[PDB]
């Protein structure tokens, strides 16, 4: 019914009120100390006071680091922005990697503003233009002003327009008898559709039909809106939504990331500080998750060394599989987890332990219950032995072919013959490696 | 169309019990790999499982790409199958992660339901009011069948579609209201007043009967990447064809994910998954492997099929060697289907299937020598030699292809080992690796 | 392989014949335009569409030029001025082509050889957008 994909079983960190964790709750099994550390981190995050904090989720492969990051995001909520990332995603061909990292830093910080909108909406009853006395004078436009008549429900008003607002009106291609929506904040117009008071069974353009808008014209309504600071930086660097010629030409041109200067970010900070001082906007700091942080070179770590010192920079969590591994982009500097020792001092390493046999067994059982598979006890034990023998992920990813073989053999339960056939058909890494070492023609 | 190297596969050749026949649907042998590919096919057809990587491995000239195209033919209609190679990821305007994400979002599909009105009748009159400069276009249409006659108002796009495919009165046209199609089925009046300018000779059609407007419901398939380019900029439809989709932002992706979830919950749209096939996967970089590792674990992620013919070799972008050229963390997430080399009977059956497809008739002894040559050097060499033996036979003005023809073809065209033995004996003739050569005869 | 049924030749007259019962509020209600075409060994008078007059004034077609109207698409193509009607003896900049040969109504089969890459690069580029 519902599409499952990878660690969908996680519903949260599964902690208690005192700050402790139960063994099997919240979709997790084990890793009690890592769970409690991430709970203290998410409490620090909800405190909304510190900036430029960083932790590291260290450990081997297939150990639960990305699971812990997803659990943190689910414990945080939708209003707090979670910005997932991979280390390889910072290498863009349009713009330097430093600006991509700073754009992600600004993308993590959220904002929630209540906004007041001045709205003229209604049905266009009349629409007359007034020409100029010298239409080919070269200066000014071919019309002078335009009178338009809008009636909402239980109201009627006549509007006299300057040529720019009517230029937007005719760019949205209104006609007599259409329901329109003038936003006086930007001059943007939205054509709602034909009024349904007239006959609605004769058009040939699949037009929607809408009743009269309730209330008077010249409404003033309050909208709550959730935006990030990166949205403000992008919207000011590529200005669209105005009605001048720069905003009109900005829509049609090809978008391209540019190195946003520090002056724009400082001006956006001053404006958001004014919005906060007005009491209309609140600051919501969030997270940024660089999975596979070993993929970054030394230059991104050098820029992080300064970008964590900002007064607005969020809390950033990292993951790494490496042990004593040389840093990418350097020649002889060998460091733990592929992370240079300057960044390790700002970091707070959260270790993550490997699993046991029974923990693997209950993880496989929970994955079978998530995927709506029914498994007998003997096949579950055999899959647990296979997990401890080959790998955990090879045991988790073998449940689906046993399900396919089960519905092939007109059964729902997974017998031992099904997991034996799935062992035969699909190989793990080690058996395929032994096949590689015992072949001549580079199989 | 033309005939290609994998044209003989017309499916995968398995039963309802997922048991392969010895030779069915143009495929022979490879029983375990065929059964495993059928299992992965049924797992795709279920659709509730997402982001599972399947790695096909074996020696060259075995049928890994043949197995992949067999899965593609058995995949059915309206299911995406993005078949790229390893080197399309590297680009000058796209990042590697962005090109991979574009491939991933091409491979997954959305089936959208729409409501459509069908109008078909004779045209009584057309009145079109265009402005002085021709910009604003508005007017009325009066279409008619034998039971009732209705008048519609026209918009700009319908009138512009009316100007092309010029519609005189008394022309039976079909109007699709949603798609905006105009289909002149013919002319039904055949008026005596005929214009000497116009050269149309549209066929006479019967007057339509029944009601004028007919409601129908249609379904069409569009991938996630197409809607991403469409919503990315104003002229996204042109960038769908010219490929000028330069690094679409993440906000667009988040909003289209929420939107297609909303369309799923309304019953309007249905999300079907697909198979993303990479050929020569070892050509990728290590950062591509890390992004594949962290992008298989997403809700919208297809069943990635991965093919390599390489043993333990150096992984690109790194200084070490790894099995299949793939690092161990990607091999952890991937289940490996292995393939095995053929015997003389399977090679004979392959060559017989190839000759039966390629419209070439062979004798028994020519087939035996082709089987022996195929089991000697390579299967692809004999499969290529069928063509030149056919052409030599038609140059000798005989319908069949004889043993002498394939012997002349074997003498005429060289294979790998013979060309190696001819290079090694004449090392002064060709340019060496140090760039030293003797072009003079003496 | 394609066929083309075309009309071309020197123009003799262009009369926008007004309609009987000429509506109201609009002057010049054309019922049809009569264009008299002449060429070598043939001369034809034609009864065209009311709408092709907009192309006639769009391409600046007057008496003394050679035009090119097709049967199916219905578009003029002003090739130039005839050599005989070189009335501006002193200073003019019009192109002058000879009067075309054959009948005015010539229908011929034309072959076109084109690569698939030309089709791809013609489909990919914007084909007359008339936008900025």
């Amino acid at each position: 019914v519902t599409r499952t994909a990878a660690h969908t079983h996680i519903k949260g960190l599964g902690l208690d009120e005192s700050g402790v964790a139960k063994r099997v709750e919240g979709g997790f099994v084990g890793q009690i100390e890592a769970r409690e550390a991430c709970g203290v981190i998410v409490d620090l995050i909800k405190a909304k006071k510190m900036s430029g904090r960083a932790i590291l989720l260290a450990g081997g492969p297939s150990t639960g680091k990305t699971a812990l990051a997803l659990a943190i995001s689910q414990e945080l909520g939708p209003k707090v922005p979670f910005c997932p990332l991979v280390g390889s995603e910072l290498y863009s061909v349009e713009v330097k990697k430093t600006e991509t990292l700073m754009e992600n830093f600004r993308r993590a910080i959220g904002l929630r503003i209540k906004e007041t909108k001045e709205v003229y909406e209604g049905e266009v009853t009349e629409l007359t233009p007034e020409d100029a006395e010298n239409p080919l004078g070269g200066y000014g436009k071919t019309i002078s002003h335009v009178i338009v008549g809008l009636k909402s429900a239980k109201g009627t008003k006549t509007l006299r327009l300057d040529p720019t607002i009517y230029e937007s009106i005719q760019r949205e291609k209104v006609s007599i008898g259409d329901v329109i929506y003038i936003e006086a904040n930007t001059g943007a117009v939205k054509r709602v559709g034909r009024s349904d008071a007239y006959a609605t069974e004769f058009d040939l353009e699949t037009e929607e039909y809408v009743p009269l808008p309730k209330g008077e014209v010249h409404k003033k309504k309050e909208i709550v809106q959730d935006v990030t600071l990166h949205d403000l930086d992008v919207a000011n660097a590529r200005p669209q939504g105005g009605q001048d010629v720069i905003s009109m030409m900005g829509q049609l041109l090809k978008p391209k990331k540019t190195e946003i200067t520090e002056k724009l970010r400082q001006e956006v900070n001053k404006v958001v500080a004014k919005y906060i001082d007005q009491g209309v906007a609140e600051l919501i700091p969030g997270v940024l998750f660089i999975d596979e942080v070993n993929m970054l070179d030394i230059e991104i770590f050098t820029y992080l060394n300064k970008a964590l010192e900002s007064n607005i920079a969020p809390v950033v969590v990292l993951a790494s599989n490496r042990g004593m591994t040389t840093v990418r982009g350097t020649e002889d500097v060998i460091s733990p987890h592929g992370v240079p020792p300057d960044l390790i001092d700002r970091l707070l390493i959260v270790r993550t332990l490997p699993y046991d046999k029974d923990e693997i067994r209950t993880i496989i059982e929970r994955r079978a219950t998530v995927e709506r598979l029914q498994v007998e006890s003997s096949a579950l034990d055999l899959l647990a032995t296979m997990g401890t023998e080959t790998s955990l992920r090879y045991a988790l990813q073998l449940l689906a072919p046993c399900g396919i073989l089960a519905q092939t053999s007109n059964r729902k339960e997974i017998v031992v013959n099904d997991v034996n056939e799935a062992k035969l058909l699909f190989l793990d890494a080690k058996r395929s490696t032994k096949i590689l070492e015992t072949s001549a023609n580079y199989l | 169309s033309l005939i290609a190297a994998h044209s003989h596969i017309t499916g995968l050749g398995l039963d309802e019990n997922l048991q392969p026949r010895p030779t069915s649907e143009g495929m022979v042998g490879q029983l375990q790999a065929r059964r495993a590919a059928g299992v992965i096919l049924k797992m795709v057809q279920n659709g509730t499982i997402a982001g599972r990587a399947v790695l096909v491995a074996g020696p060259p000239s075995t049928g890994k790409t043949a197995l992949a195209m067999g899965v593609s033919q058995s995949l059915g209609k309206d299911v995406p199958f993005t078949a790229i190679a390893g080197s399309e990821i590297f680009s000058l305007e796209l990042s590697k992660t962005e090109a991979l994400t574009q491939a991933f979002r091409k491979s997954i599909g959305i089936k959208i339901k729409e409501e459509t009105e069908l109008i078909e009748g004779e045209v009584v009159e057309i009145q079109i009011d265009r402005s002085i400069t021709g910009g604003h276009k508005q007017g009325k249409l009066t279409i008619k069948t034998t039971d009732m006659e209705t008048i519609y108002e026209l918009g700009n796009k319908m009138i512009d579609g009316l100007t092309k495919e010029k519609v005189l009165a008394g022309d039976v046209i079909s109007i699709d209201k949603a798609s905006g199609k105009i289909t002149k089925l013919g002319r039904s009046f055949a008026r005596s007043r005929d214009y000497d300018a116009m050269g149309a000779d549209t066929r006479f059609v019967q007057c339509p009967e029944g009601e004028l407007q007919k409601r129908k419901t249609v379904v069409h398939t569009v991938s996630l990447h197409e809607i991403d380019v469409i919503n990315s900029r104003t002229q996204g439809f042109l960038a769908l064809f010219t490929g000028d989709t330069g690094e679409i932002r993440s906000e667009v992706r988040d909003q289209i994910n929420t939107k297609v979830a909303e369309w799923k919950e309304e019953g309007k749209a249905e999300i079907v998954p697909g198979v993303l096939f990479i050929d020569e996967v070892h050509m990728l970089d290590i950062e591509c492997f890390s992004f594949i590792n962290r992008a298989l674990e997403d809700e919208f992620a297809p069943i990635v099929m991965m093919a390599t013919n390489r043993g333990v070799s150096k992984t690109r972008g790194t200084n070490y060697k790894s099995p299949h050229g793939l690092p161990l963390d990607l091999l952890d997430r991937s289940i490996i289907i292995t393939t095995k080399s053929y015997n003389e009977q399977e090679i004979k059956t392959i060559l017989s299937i190839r000759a039966q497809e390629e419209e070439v008739e062979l004798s028994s002894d020519a087939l035996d020598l082709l089987t022996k040559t195929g089991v000697e050097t390579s299967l692809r060499y004999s499969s290529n030699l069928i063509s030149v033996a056919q052409q030599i036979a038609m140059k000798r003005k005989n319908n069949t292809v004889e043993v002498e023809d394939v012997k002349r073809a074997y003498l005429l065209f060289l294979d790998s080992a013979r060309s190696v033995k001819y290079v090694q004996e004449n090392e002064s003739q060709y340019i060496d690796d140090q760039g030293n050569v003797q072009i003079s005869i003496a | 392989k394609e066929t083309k049924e075309v009309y071309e030749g020197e123009v003799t007259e262009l009369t926008p014949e007004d309609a009987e019962n000429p509506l109201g509020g609009y002057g010049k209600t054309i019922s049809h335009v009569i264009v008299g075409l002449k060429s070598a060994k043939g001369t034809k008078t034609l009864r065209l569409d009311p709408t092709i007059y907009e192309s006639i004034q769009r391409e600046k077609v007057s008496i003394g030029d050679v035009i090119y109207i097709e049967a199916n698409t219905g578009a003029v193509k002003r090739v130039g001025r005839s050599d005989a009607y070189a009335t501006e003896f002193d200073l003019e900049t019009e192109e002058y082509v000879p009067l075309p040969k054959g009948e005015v109504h010539k229908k011929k089969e034309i072959v076109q050889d084109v690569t698939l890459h030309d089709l791809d690069v013609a489909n990919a580029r914007p084909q007359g957008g008339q936008d900025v």
Binding site: - | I128, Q138 | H32, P50
Partner: peptide, 28 residues
């Protein structure tokens, strides 16, 4: 009852008219 038709404003533009018998073009 039956709803009225939308008001069709045809002032200020040329008219191309095609009917069953003969074709018209009222231009300015």
């Amino acid at each position: 009852f039956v709803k009225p038709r939308r008001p069709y404003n045809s002032e200020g533009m040329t008219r191309i008219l095609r009917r069953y018998e003969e074709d018209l073009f009222c231009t300015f």
